[PDB]
Design an enzyme around this catalytic site. Structure first.
Site, PDB file in Angstrom:
ATOM      1  N   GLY I  29     -29.531 -56.232 -40.190  1.00  0.00           N
ATOM      2  CA  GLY I  29     -29.713 -56.417 -41.631  1.00  0.00           C
ATOM      3  C   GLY I  29     -28.656 -57.283 -42.294  1.00  0.00           C
ATOM      4  O   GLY I  29     -27.701 -57.718 -41.650  1.00  0.00           O
ATOM      5  N   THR I  30     -28.830 -57.522 -43.593  1.00  0.00           N
ATOM      6  CA  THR I  30     -27.914 -58.371 -44.362  1.00  0.00           C
ATOM      7  C   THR I  30     -26.605 -57.639 -44.634  1.00  0.00           C
ATOM      8  O   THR I  30     -26.537 -56.415 -44.526  1.00  0.00           O
ATOM      9  CB  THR I  30     -28.516 -58.814 -45.716  1.00  0.00           C
ATOM     10  N   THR I  31     -25.574 -58.393 -44.999  1.00  0.00           N
ATOM     11  CA  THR I  31     -24.245 -57.828 -45.230  1.00  0.00           C
ATOM     12  C   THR I  31     -24.154 -57.143 -46.596  1.00  0.00           C
ATOM     13  O   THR I  31     -24.542 -57.715 -47.614  1.00  0.00           O
ATOM     14  CB  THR I  31     -23.146 -58.906 -45.137  1.00  0.00           C
ATOM     15  N   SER I  74     -27.701 -51.532 -45.715  1.00  0.00           N
ATOM     16  CA  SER I  74     -28.086 -52.631 -44.834  1.00  0.00           C
ATOM     17  C   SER I  74     -28.974 -52.106 -43.716  1.00  0.00           C
ATOM     18  O   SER I  74     -28.705 -51.047 -43.153  1.00  0.00           O
ATOM     19  CB  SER I  74     -26.843 -53.284 -44.228  1.00  0.00           C
TER      20      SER I  74
END
Ligand code: CL
Ligand code: MG
Ligand code: MG
Lengths: 241, 244, 250, 195, 111, 235, 240, 231, 243
Positions: I29-31, I74
């Site tokens: 996932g994204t930060t 995330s």
């Protein structure tokens, strides 16, 4: 080979999921120790804060179950808190129903029975933890009772749990072979904590700072954990003799 | 999820057989032989205890012959614990019927009820069947003396003489050979013990390896008496018939 | 969530074996030796207190348990399974008997109730059988003294004397030679201690041996006086000292 | 409904039951049959609260007919009466109890004996030589006490029953529009079409 | 004791013409001898060229009209935007009212 | 084993796709919609000559204005018909009117995917639902065990479906009469059927606004079969 | 509760559990049904592997559902009892609410409905039973004979057989049964039913059961001697 | 492979294959396009037929007077999810006298789809939805995936060959967003967008389906000769 | 083998592989990050702009619980939403019974026990999210981070997602260079920088920055989104530092 996935008997009469839960116990790589004084029961545990981003005050494996009972856990923190919350609820309910504070050994038995159920019922997994309960019981006096994933429990004069339990156990065994008594003959809890820390240092062969340890103390009518400064005072006294 | 570990106890094989029922019957074939013989003036129940010990307290022991009510009794072949679950259910059904109609339950009605319970475990629930085969010996005023048998499938049938448990093939041949319709209880007692004596896997048939019972109208006037034989009484009938 | 294991985990194999029950019996075989001997005026049950650690207080772990004032139990196999069975056995003695008839159940019927619980764990959904074999000794007015064995399958048998667990085969042979129908309680206790010494490796004393009897009524253990018909419990656990006294005359 | 009588003689049971069905102000029917055949040799008459009476009778009838088919066997009058009693004894502690009183007249083919059972809505069963429910007994029992004999014929039973009905028609305030009489014996159940 | 019903007064009138219909009603709302409102609409347009008024206990009246308007909406969803005929609406209202047969909507409804 | 409501890697429900294979094994059913009425016809397919063929009920009435024909595991259709009849009658009770053919079909199709671990598996039967209402006139729908229903001018389901559908492709036009449709169903049934078509092993039915849903007598169908034979021999 | 989907579709569009239930029927003892002009006869095979049996008390193969309808079967015996019980309850429930006994078609439709329900309900297996249901509708003199099977399909038959070696007796019936002129009398119908079983049975002793059902709740089971007379007459005509 | 037997099982790389297979059913489905301005929101759907005798499967469903969606994948699943939206839109109106916000409608769909991906026995929804609406904060367009992921967009497309229409909208972004107070021109842009996803077949009178909602425009679907104007 | 096919099954190591596979989804996932400041906390997240068609500032990822707690996560976004919905129920029932708003440590355990519960059975799947959350209570500011296993600790700084190593390194510098502490307005700026620096692991697509904060002085202890001028100020600061 599904007899190793759920809690059913293998051809050897063994429950592998229970055995593997015992192995999860040492996943934290922490060693705990419990001893009894005259008027008190002391429990010490290694504190390891590897990350600098962590708030070290929130990193704990010692729990205040009731006013009288304290519990240290050997195993992963999620299962530890699962056991802690339940033990708290059980101790509170007991007092409400039966009109007196739940004894340490009775709580240990209750939690052990719950652990037993997970070894027999398939849908529930065992908790990968070893629960060491401590108190100064109003009937039995200073008490150490320990529970494991098998549902086994027993009282102790003193005990040790973790990766290096055997080294600590033998060290404690030898001391009680000399003194020939079931406890640490000492008036103040402060000195019983000093004994506990000293004998862990000897057994493990490592030195400790104030942030490397975590201490819990049970006295009559209350259990409490020591702050970093309370432990520091303890370490100073050890070094000065 | 849980599906992974499900044995699926209630399914047909490609041949149209119920796996678990067939395997339960295989289990029962290793159990001690039980024999029932129906005569004109009574019924005989004879059964063999499985490899006993000298230290077993025989006089207080019961693994084969059980009482359902004053008129009906059963001989067990298979898992004793499973049989006791069903026996208590049967005892309750008999008492329910007695309470409702104020009359002792007819033998077949009791047999059907138990047999239906067994059937249920083979069609629904996902549980293992009861590893038990019964021989029902009983009496009522409609059909008189009756012998039935039920097995894990829940199928039951009526008999003049029948065996369950071990060596039923050999036992049933011997019964089929010496049985006659005008036979009496004292003759049936002898046939039952003679059959067990020949089919037994033991070296010799003795009193300590047997349970025995008779349902007789040999009770004072128009009524029926159950007699569960005591160890000393089994020893006496073994000498009388000339086996020991 | 929900217990989605609503199906049997114990099932018949092609050979007609119930695997989980056999494996439970294998677990019992690994367990520490326990035994029971019936005398004319009492029953004795005994076992070894196998201490897991010398730091552990083996007095806190009770292998021999009171079920009713006149009934006691001992086991071989998995201790935790035994502990919950004792809890259930004590409760069922009240709920299914004492609260109905106003008196404690006879040995055979309490044994029957325990057996039922163990049978259900052999057929019910989502559970394994209990990994213990019990030896239940008891007394009641109409049946007198009795001794029963209960297995993981739920099957139970009455015994004059027997042994279960580790060295049961050797112990049963030892008991067969010594037992007779004219034994007094003290003679049975003596034989029990002799038999149990064979299966024990290390220390053999009152602190490493657990032993209880079903014998005479103990009015000193009743806790009250004033009711003639209430004469006290027949179950009595022997003390560490009482065991050592008889080990000198061994 | 109103009046239901029963009398057990030598070789049969006779049940008499009123024909009237009254709804407060008007008599809606004067030919109502307050009885059901439970089995070939067992008849049940009934009286009580509207709706409940027929609902209960037909429910019992169905259950006995179900038993007859399942076992290929007729239950004894004693067995049927016990079943009926239990249903009423169960009913009285229900949310809404069946308000129904019954007489069960049957001929036991095994014992070759007629049998009359009186059961009220509470589940109070009694075996009797003659019985009634409601106010019917108050007028009739004094006549039955006097004239009844256990060895009476069916014709004598009917004559004694006529004397009972006559006394009811004389002293009761309600017009119950006569009675339907039925006889239960070894040959089964039949209705006396002229009474 | 709690009385779940009340009387909000009011009066309504429906007259069917040859090719039209009217549903009238006063706008006064009351309790006992007090006036709650001098203008509280009582007759409602429910869509599909149907008008409705539930006179009596205003809470039950508002509840019923609200449920009927809802029934019209779901009739369109379930049956491909078909127009609810006045006769079908009437039968639907019967079922709404009889649904609470043993705790009735204390209103006299006219559509 | 595997879930009952499992998706395949292609994005299809295994059980729904397998139930479609069972429907392919079923006897042929054909529906043709015209402006004078909708015609439903089926292959009876008796497994033996001793089986009384008039007891084979593969065409069924749902309401006076809606009929239904089935193909596949026909035992599975009984609960679908029961639900359809109840839905039709229930809607009349609530709304004092006939229910739309589409709405009826939609109600039936809502049952289809109510399976899992509700019923244990999908239905093993496809339905041709034919009817009439005031809003959309004469209609023919094809209800599958996927829960999907398509409206059709003409449709064939069962073992001879793709062969029959290709034939219906050529033959159907918007100006068909009821009599023309009747003969067309009989023609195509006779083409795809194993056994020779007669009044005992094939059944006709229709739905008209005036007379409602009617299953045809064997005597009536026999005349239409004889009329068909002559018109095919006519060229 | 146990919810496991035991009856499910396979890639080839088959429900194997329903098909394996039919294999259990194939194993069952042969049952045959023949309807005449004014009667129906239900014949049933009794396997002679079981002697020392008590025929008084042993469950009979033909069962009365009501006084006017009967049910025989082939397949699992224990399973059949559950269908028979349900059918008997429904027969009394129909009389109680409709004030009229069940038609033979209705009773068949109910039993077939129960069988179907067990083929798409969770946690249950199909009935390993096919039935032959026969009788006469109330106030009707037309004979009725229906068949059901594990899948839940049902249909009417002029004559039909189910169970082991049913293929053979169906072969016999297909050439011997004429629709234009069925067995006019009880004798002719019973004879044809016994004849059809004699193709398969083995010995004509206690291996054949016959039950004759006539209009207006007239049901009777033939005895050993009565059946033995048919067996005797059939073979004496055959010796030619 | 070994981790696609049910929705409750992660793969070794942290993937949910049953959800990804449900996602695949959408790609098999017929193309549908969504786009909006500041005043109006438009759905354009390519309907699919079984054959020439069959009708064209409806692709657009109305949820309220101010909201509706277009589907691609298992139509029965779209009926379940649209029915749920209808109830939630309706609960908001009855209880709070409030038209349900399009953003909140997306949140409700996300959470309903999620429960089906974490529990044993059930299955993910096999359909993708494009929700359009006009609420108190103007026009809106959402894209629902049965993984649970809901996304607010200016324009988008789902279904087979949807990448062509999605690229066109990505170029036209600055133009069609400015089409305010002109429904016919916004629809034209949507019809031109969906045309980029066509191969072999073209837009006919019973093939094309269009819906629109706006400032003073209730959610209304256009089928048949009503869309002949835009062909 | 087969120990990784079912949830709640211990491997011979003593590990639950299904929980470890859930972590892989989190890592994918994204930060997202969290920063504990002097009198509050700051949350920030990386939002990948998959296409130009995404409406800016509309697809909000950070969620509020009660009025004083902020949550960001995330991994699988729906799993995060489900967890927040539960958190809101827990916080609602706590306030219902005890009147006071739920303390952050109390709240942390409520989520912890719920996530841990999804490692006890094979009938459920573990959560595919690591959640960073916190706020201001009576005892001051608290920052927590909760993993798929149910494990959670208190933090000075926290980071998860694909650019967690980059973020963690940056957070460690702040802890070292500010022992006396960091201000709320400083933390917002630093949060913007760290997300921009952590965007190198997701450098293919461009992104949108989203920040929120609870602060006793700046927001009265309530959770608020960083909007308008304060957001642009932080973006400018972040863009200046990368160049
Ligand atoms: Cl407990
Ligand atoms: Mg388990
Ligand atoms: Mg009375």
């Amino acid at each position: 080979g599904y007899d190793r996935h759920i809690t059913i008997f293998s051809p050897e009469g063994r429950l592998y999921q229970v055995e593997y839960a015992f192995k999860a116990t040492n996943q934290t790589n922490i060693n705990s120790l419990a001893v009894r004084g005259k008027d008190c029961t002391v429990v010490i545990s290694q504190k390891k804060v590897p990350d600098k981003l962590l708030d070290p005050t929130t990193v704990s494996y010692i729990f205040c179950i009731s006013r009288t009972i304290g519990m240290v856990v050997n195993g992963p923190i999620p299962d530890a808190r699962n056991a802690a919350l339940r033990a708290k609820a059980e101790a509170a309910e007991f007092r409400y129903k039966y009109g007196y504070d739940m004894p340490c050994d009775v709580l240990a038995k209750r939690m052990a029975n719950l652990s037993q159920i997970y070894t027999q019922r398939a849908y529930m997994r065992p908790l990968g933890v070893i629960l060491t309960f401590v108190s100064v019981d109003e009937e039995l006096g200073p008490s150490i009772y320990k529970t494991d994933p098998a549902g086994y429990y027993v009282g102790y004069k003193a005990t040790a749990t973790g990766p290096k339990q055997q080294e600590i156990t033998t060290n404690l065994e030898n001391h009680f072979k000399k003194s020939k008594i079931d406890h640490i003959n000492e008036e103040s809890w402060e000195k019983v904590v000093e004994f506990a820390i000293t004998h862990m240092i000897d057994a493990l062969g490592t030195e400790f700072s104030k942030n490397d340890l975590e201490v819990g103390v049970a006295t009559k009518d209350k259990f409490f954990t020591l702050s970093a400064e309370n432990i520091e005072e303890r370490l100073v006294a050890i070094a000065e003799q | 999820g849980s599906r992974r570990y499900d044995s699926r106890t209630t399914i047909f094989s490609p041949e149209g057989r119920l796996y678990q029922v067939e395997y339960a019957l295989e289990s029962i074939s290793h159990a001690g032989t039980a024999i029932g013989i129906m005569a004109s003036d009574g019924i005989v129940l004879a059964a063999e205890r499985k490899v006993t010990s000298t230290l077993l307290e025989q006089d207080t022991s019961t693994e084969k012959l059980y009482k359902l009510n004053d008129k009906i009794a059963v001989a067990v072949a298979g898992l004793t614990a499973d049989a006791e679950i069903l026996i208590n259910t049967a005892r309750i059904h008999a008492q329910n019927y007695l309470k409702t109609y104020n009359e002792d339950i007819p033998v077949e009605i009791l047999v059907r009820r138990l047999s239906d319970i067994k059937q249920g475990y083979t069609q629904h629930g996902g549980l293992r069947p009861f590893g038990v085969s019964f021989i029902y010996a009983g009496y009522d005023d409609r059909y008189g003396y009756q012998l039935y048998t039920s097995n894990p499938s829940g199928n039951y049938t009526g008999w003049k003489a029948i065996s369950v448990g071990a060596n039923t093939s050999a036992a049933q041949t011997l019964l089929q050979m010496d049985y006659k319709d005008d036979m009496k209880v004292d003759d049936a007692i002898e046939l039952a013990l003679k059959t067990l004596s020949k089919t037994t896997d033991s070296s010799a048939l003795t009193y300590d390896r047997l349970e025995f019972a008779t349902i007789r109208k040999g009770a004072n006037d128009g009524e029926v008496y159950q007699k569960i034989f005591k160890p000393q009484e089994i020893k006496d009938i073994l000498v009388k018939t000339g086996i020991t | 969530m929900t217990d989605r294991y609503s199906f049997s985990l114990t099932t018949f194999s092609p050979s007609g074996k119930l695997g989980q029950i056999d494996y439970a019996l294998t677990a019992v075989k690994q367990g520490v030796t326990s035994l029971g001997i019936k005398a004319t005026n009492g029953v004795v049950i005994a076992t070894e207190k196998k201490s897991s650690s010398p730091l552990a207080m083996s007095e806190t772990l009770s292998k021999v348990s009171l079920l009713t004032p006149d009934i006691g139990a001992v086991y071989s196999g998995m201790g935790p399974d035994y502990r919950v069975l004792v809890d259930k056995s004590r409760k069922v003695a009240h709920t299914s008997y004492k609260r109905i008839y106003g008196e404690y159940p006879p040995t055979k019927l309490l044994v029957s109730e325990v057996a039922k619980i163990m049978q259900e764990a052999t057929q019910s959904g989502g559970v394994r059988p209990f990994g213990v074999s019990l030896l239940i000794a008891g007394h009641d007015e109409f049946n007198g003294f009795s001794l029963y064995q209960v297995d993981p399958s739920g099957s139970y048998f009455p015994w004059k004397a027997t042994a279960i667990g580790k060295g049961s085969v050797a112990a049963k042979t030892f008991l067969e030679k010594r037992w007779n129908d004219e034994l007094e309680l003290e003679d049975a206790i003596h034989i029990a201690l002799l038999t149990l010494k064979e299966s024990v490796e290390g220390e053999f004393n009152g602190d490493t041996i657990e032993l209880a009897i079903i014998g005479d009524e103990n009015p000193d253990l009743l806790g009250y006086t004033g009711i003639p018909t209430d004469k006290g419990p027949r179950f009595r656990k022997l003390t560490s000292q009482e065991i050592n006294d008889r080990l000198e005359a061994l | 409904m109103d009046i239901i009588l029963g009398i057990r003689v030598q070789d049969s049971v006779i049940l008499a039951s009123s024909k009237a069905v009254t709804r407060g102000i008007s008599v809606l029917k004067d030919s109502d049959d307050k009885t059901r055949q439970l089995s070939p040799h067992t008849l049940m008459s009934f009286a009580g609260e509207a709706g409940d009476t027929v609902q209960f009778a037909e429910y019992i009838q169905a259950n006995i007919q179900l038993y007859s088919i399942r076992e290929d066997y007729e239950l004894s009058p004693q067995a049927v009466s016990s079943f009926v009693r239990q249903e009423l004894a169960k009913s009285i502690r229900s949310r809404r109890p069946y308000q129904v009183n019954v007489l069960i007249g049957g001929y036991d083919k095994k014992k070759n004996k007629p049998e009359l059972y009186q059961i009220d809505y509470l589940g109070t069963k009694v075996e009797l030589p003659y019985g009634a429910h409601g106010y019917s007994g108050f007028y009739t029992f004094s006549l039955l006490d006097h004239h009844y004999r256990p060895d009476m014929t069916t014709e004598e039973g009917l004559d004694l029953l006529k004397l009972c009905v006559q006394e009811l028609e004389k002293r009761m305030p309600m017009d119950f529009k006569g009675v339907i009489v039925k006889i239960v014996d070894k040959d089964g159940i039949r209705q006396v079409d002229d009474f | 004791q709690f009385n779940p019903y009340g009387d909000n007064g009011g009066t309504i009138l429906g007259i069917a013409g040859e090719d039209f219909a009217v549903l009238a009603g006063d706008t006064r709302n009351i309790t006992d001898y007090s006036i709650n409102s001098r203008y509280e609409p009582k007759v409602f347009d429910c869509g599909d060229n149907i008008v409705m008024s539930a006179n009596g206990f205003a809470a039950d009246g508002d509840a019923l009209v609200k449920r009927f308007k809802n029934s019209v909406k779901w009739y369109h969803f379930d049956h491909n935007d078909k127009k609810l005929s006045i006769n079908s609406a009437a039968r639907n209202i019967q079922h709404l009212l009889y649904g609470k047969r043993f705790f009735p909507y204390y209103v006299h409804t006219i559509i | 084993d595997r879930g009952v409501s499992t998706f395949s890697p292609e994005g299809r429900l295994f059980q729904v796709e397998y139930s479609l294979e069972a429907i392919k094994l079923g006897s042929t059913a054909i529906g043709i919609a015209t402006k004078e009425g909708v015609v439903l016809g089926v292959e009876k397919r008796a497994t033996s000559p001793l089986l009384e063929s008039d007891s084979i009920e593969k065409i069924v009435e749902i309401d006076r204005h809606i009929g239904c024909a089935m193909s596949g595991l026909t035992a599975d259709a009984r609960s679908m018909i029961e639900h359809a009849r109840t839905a039709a009658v229930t809607h009349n009770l609530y709304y004092d009117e006939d229910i739309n053919v589409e709405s009826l079909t939609q109600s039936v199709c809502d049952l289809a995917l109510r399976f899992g671990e509700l019923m244990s598996r999908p239905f093993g039967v496809a339905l041709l639902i034919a009817g009439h209402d005031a809003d959309d006139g004469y209609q023919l729908f094809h209800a599958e065990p996927s829960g999907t229903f398509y409206r059709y001018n003409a449709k064939a389901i069962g073992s001879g479906s793709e062969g029959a559908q290709a034939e219906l492709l050529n033959e159907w036009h918007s100006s068909l009469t009821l009599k023309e449709a009747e003969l067309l169903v009989l023609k195509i049934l006779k083409q795809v059927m194993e056994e020779k078509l007669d009044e005992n092993n094939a059944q006709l039915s229709c739905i008209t606004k005036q007379d409602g849903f009617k299953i045809y007598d064997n005597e009536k169908t026999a005349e239409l079969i004889k009329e068909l034979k002559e018109k095919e021999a006519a060229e | 509760g146990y919810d496991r989907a035991l009856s499910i579709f396979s890639p080839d569009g088959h429900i194997f559990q329903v098909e394996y239930a039919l294999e259990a029927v194939k194993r069952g003892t042969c049952a045959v049904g023949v309807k005449g002009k004014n009667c129906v006869v239900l014949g049933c095979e009794r396997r002679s592997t079981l002697k020392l049996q008590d025929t008084r008390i042993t469950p009979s193969k033909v069962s009365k559902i009501d006084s006017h309808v009967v049910l025989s079967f082939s397949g699992l015996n224990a399973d059949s009892r559950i269908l028979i019980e349900k059918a008997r309850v429904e027969a009394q429930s129909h009389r109680l609410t409709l004030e009229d006994p069940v038609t033979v078609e209705y009773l068949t439709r109910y039993v077939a409905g129960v069988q179907q329900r067990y083929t798409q309900s969770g946690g249950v297996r199909p009935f390993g039973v096919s039935t032959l249901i026969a009788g006469f509708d109330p106030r009707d003199d037309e004979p009725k004979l229906y068949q059901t099977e594990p899948s839940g399909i049902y249909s009417s038959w002029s004559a039909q057989t189910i169970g082991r070696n049913s293929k053979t007796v169906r072969e016999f019936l297909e050439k011997n049964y004429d629709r234009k002129e069925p067995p006019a009398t009880v004798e002719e119908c019973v004879k044809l039913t016994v004849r059809s079983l004699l193709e398969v049975v083995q010995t004509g002793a206690k291996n054949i059961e016959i039950t004759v059902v006539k209009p207006d709740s007239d049901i009777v089971a033939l005895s050993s001697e009565e059946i033995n007379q048919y067996v005797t007459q059939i073979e004496q005509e055959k010796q030619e | 492979n070994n981790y696609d037997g049910d929705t409750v099982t992660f793969s070794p790389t942290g993937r949910l294959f049953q959800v990804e297979y449900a996602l695949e059913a959408i790609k098999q489905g017929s193309v549908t396009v969504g786009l909006r301005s500041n005043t109006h929101a438009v759905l354009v759907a390519l309907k699919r037929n079984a054959d020439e005798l069959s009708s064209y499967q409806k692709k657009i469903i109305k949820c309220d007077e101010h909201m509706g969606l277009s589907l691609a994948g298992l139509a029965p699943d779209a009926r379940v999810l649209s029915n749920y939206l209808r109830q939630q839109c309706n609960y908001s109106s009855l209880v709070f006298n409030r038209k349900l916000a399009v953003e909140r409608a997306g949140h409700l769909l996300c959470d309903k789809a999620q429960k089906n991906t974490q529990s044993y026995g059930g299955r993910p929804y096999g359909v993708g939805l494009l929700i359009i609406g006009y609420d108190k904060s103007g026009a809106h367009l959402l894209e629902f995936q049965p993984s649970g992921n809901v996304t607010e967009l200016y324009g988008t497309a789902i279904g087979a060959r949807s990448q062509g229409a999605k690229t066109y909208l990505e170029r036209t972004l600055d133009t069609f967003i400015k089409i305010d107070g002109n429904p016919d021109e916004l629809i034209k842009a949507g019809v031109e967008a969906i045309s980029q996803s066509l191969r072999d077949e073209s837009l006919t009178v019973d093939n094309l389906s269009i819906a629109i909602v706006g400032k003073d425009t209730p959610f209304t679907i256009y089928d048949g000769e009503a869309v002949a104007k835009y062909i | 083998t087969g120990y990784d096919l079912s949830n709640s099954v211990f491997s011979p190591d003593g590990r639950n592989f299904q929980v470890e596979y859930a972590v892989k989804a989190v890592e994918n996932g994204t930060t997202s990050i969290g920063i504990k400041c002097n009198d509050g906390v700051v949350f920030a997240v990386e939002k990948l702009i998959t296409s130009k068609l995404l409406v800016p500032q509309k697809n909000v990822k950070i969620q509020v619980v009660d009025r004083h707690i902020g949550c960001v996560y995330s991994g699988l976004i729906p799993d995060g939403r489900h967890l927040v919905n539960r958190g809101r129920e827990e916080a609602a029932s706590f306030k219902k019974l005890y009147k006071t708003p739920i303390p952050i440590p109390a709240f942390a355990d409520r989520l912890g026990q719920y996530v841990q519960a999804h490692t006890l059975y094979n009938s459920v799947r573990p959560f595919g999210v690591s959640t960073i959350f916190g706020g201001v209570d009576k005892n001051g500011a608290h920052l927590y981070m909760l993993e798929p296993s149910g494990s959670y600790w208190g933090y000075k700084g926290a980071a998860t997602g694909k650019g967690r190593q980059s973020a963690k390194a940056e957070l460690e510098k702040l802890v070292d260079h500010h022992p006396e502490g960091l201000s709320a307005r400083e933390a917002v700026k630093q949060a913007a920088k760290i997300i921009y620096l952590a965007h190198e692991d997701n450098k293919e697509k461009d992104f949108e920055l989203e920040i929120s904060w609870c602060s006793l002085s700046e927001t009265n202890g309530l959770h608020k989104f960083v909007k308008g001028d304060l957001l642009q100020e932080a973006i400018d600061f972040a863009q200046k530092e990368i160049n």
